[PDB]
Amino acid sequence: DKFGRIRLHVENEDKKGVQLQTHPNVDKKLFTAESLIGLKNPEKSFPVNSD
Amino acid sequence: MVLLAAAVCTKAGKAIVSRQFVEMTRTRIEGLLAAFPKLMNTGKQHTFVETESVRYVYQPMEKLYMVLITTKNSNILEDLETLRLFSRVIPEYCRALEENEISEHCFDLIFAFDEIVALGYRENVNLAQIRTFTEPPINMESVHMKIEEKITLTCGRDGGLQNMELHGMIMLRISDDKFGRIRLHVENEDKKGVQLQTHPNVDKKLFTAESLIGLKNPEKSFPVNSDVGVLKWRLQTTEESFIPLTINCWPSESGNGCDVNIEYELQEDNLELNDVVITIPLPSGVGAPVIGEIDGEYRHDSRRNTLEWCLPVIDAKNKSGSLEFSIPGQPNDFFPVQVSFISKKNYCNIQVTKVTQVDGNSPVRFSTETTFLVDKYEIL
Amino acid sequence: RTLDLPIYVTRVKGNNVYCLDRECRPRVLTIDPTEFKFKLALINRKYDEVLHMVRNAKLVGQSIIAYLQKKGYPEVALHFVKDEKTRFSLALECGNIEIALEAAKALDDKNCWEKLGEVALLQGNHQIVEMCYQRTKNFDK
Structure with a gap:
């Protein structure tokens, strides 16, 4: 829920x-x-393609 | 530079020819020469006269002033001597001073000025030189060894070793009777x-x-500087030196702000370091930081623009912080972080395997101690 | 407003002011709700009204962004505080130097830390004084 920051x-x-x-x-x-x-994830599934 | 300019003037109210060694006094040269040399440099028929906080040395020749100017000075004799040598060189080019003939041999005079005084430091010239250019108690017997070392390191974020070097010596203090041979x-x-x-x-x-x-030790304490590597050496930390700390820096762009996590690693857990500080720098548009650390105290310091973490003693440990930044400009490259530390080992890896003494019975090696200190230890 | 010629006001009858000079060429000028609205609003302690009022036809440097740092019980002061100096000032006028230290910081200067630290001792609490006084290097004080 909400918009959570994720690291x-x-x-x-x-x-x-x-x-x-x-x-x-x-x-x-x-x-x-x-x-x-760090990033706020889109909800559902997405390619993270983090840094 | 000590010597701003070397200048030939006409007191017509202008610098007739002049030399700017490095780009500084362009137009500036003309205004100084034009005002001050008119009044005889404001002199009274004295070779040194200082006006508007600039030292003017001069000699009058006709309506013209040959002028040396400085605003700093290294020695008394020197300022006159470059002017003097200049005064041998100037009539060869222009047959005394006179504005029209000075004007025509701008190149000649100017070249001499560069040659005579180079980057404001008074070199020497001569008319021939100029030419090339224009062409008993043994119960007590004890021994102690102290290995004191400092290690230096430069490392990349990647953990590249870059350069490192260890400096150290092993001092021995021995109370031994007789003269015993030691190996x-x-x-x-x-x-x-x-x-x-x-x-x-x-x-x-x-x-x-x-x-x-092997050696007979002097009694009391002395630098062993033994053979082998020696007991006084600079070894490379690079060559097999252990770096007690490795810092892994993970900067992160929180977006407007920046989140920095700093990872510290120590050698074997058992060993503990002391006097450790990590200096993590911050960018100029600081805002304020919030820092969290499990062990020790951490404090942000403006001015220094660095966040300093201090730990009395550490088995090993880490810290994190969040930064707030106004964002002027674009992103800024990071400056390296430095650390200070003390370790009870030598990270030149000097080990004293054995020191056996002869000429008598077994002495007691009461203690061997190692003091390891950080030198310039930098990691980006 | 400024005109491009020297002039004499002909007189004010209506919102306009009318002018004629020696040679007698005219200039007219509508009395604006620029500078006038802003301070009519600030006088009647409105800061919310005044933010809109702030325009670049009347911003200047000290009638909006630093004239509003001129209350000994901060009111106007609270509103404009953007300058590290105005922030410093604001703090002593309240007597709460918590903001001072930060302004003092952002003024990049030691003198401010010792002076706010002294004000701090005056509000009564010495933790705040210590921190300041430590970094001005008045360990002996």
């Missing part, structure tokens, strides 16, 4: 190849350590 | 950086396997 934490990736796409409503956070992504 | 055994070191110093009375031993160092 996603994932492992850090590297890629010899390339490609990454982010859904809108995806924000990037800069932290000294660790990386974080 | 020191330590781990083997490598260093991207370089530096090692050995105390005298240090001997190097060659063995088929393992390396050994």
Whole structure:
């Protein structure tokens, strides 16, 4: 319910190849350590395509 | 620069030819020269006269002033001496001073000015040079070893090692009777950086396997600076040094605001560091922060534009904060975070494997202690 | 309003004012509800009315955005507080320096922290004084 802010934490990736796409409503956070992504999700199912 | 300009003037009310070493005094040159040199630089027939907070040194030649100007000064003799050498060079170009002939040899004079005084520092010139251009108690016997080290690190957000280097020495304080021979055994070191110093009375031993160092210690405390790596060296933290802390910074764009999470990691949980502080910088349009941390105290400081987290002692731990920002401009790149820390180990990984002493019975190695300190430790 | 010539007012009869100069070329000017409405409103302690009234034909610098920081029991002051200085001022005039410290911060200056800290000791509470006084570096005080 409501509009909740969500923060996603994932492992850090590297890629010899390339490609990454982010859904809108995806924000990037800069932290000294660790990386974080935050977003208000659309309700229902959507491709997160987080940061 | 100490010397603003070197200038030839006509007291017609203008700088006839003049030199701006680096772009500063363009039009400025003409107004100064035009007003002040007319009054004899406001002089009284004195080579130094200062007016409108600018030192003017001069010599009159006809209706013209050869002028040196400074507003700072390194030495008395020097200011005159560049002017003087200039005065040997100027009649070669213009047959005394005279506005029309000075005007015609703007190039000559100007070139000499660059050559004579370079970036305001008075070089020297000469008429020939100018040419090329225009061409008993042993019960007591005890020993103590103290390894003091500082480690430096530069690391990327990615965790790239970048450069690092450890600096340290191992001091020995020994109370031993007689003169006992001691052999020191330590781990083997490598260093991207370089530096090692050995105390005298240090001997190097060659063995088929393992390396050994032997020496008679001076009594009391002295820097061992043994052989091997040495007990006085700069080793590279890069070469096998452990960085007690790794900071993982995850900045996040909350949107208008920014959310920063800072991750701190320590070595083995058992070991605890002390005097740890993490300095996480913030952008200029600060608003106010709300910070939360499980351990220690954290405080935002304007002025510094940094958030500082302090932890008396840590097994290991982390902090988070949310920032509010007015958003002028566009996004700003982050500045690196720095940390200070103390650890009871050496992260040059110096280990004292064994120090055996001879000339007598077993001494007691009462204590070996390690003090590890942060040097410039920076991570983006 | 300004005209582009020097002039004499011919007189005021009606909303208009009429003018003629020495050579006697005319200028007329409708009396506006610009500057007039804004302060008619501020006098009758309306700030809600006054926000609309704020226009760029009458904004100036100190009749809207810093003239409204001129009450010793803040009223006008509460409304315009946008300048880090106006914010600082506002705080001593109430005697609550909680806002002061922030304005003092945003004024990027030590002097403000020690002076608001002293005002703080005056409202009675020394936690607030400590914080200020600590960062002005008056550890001995």
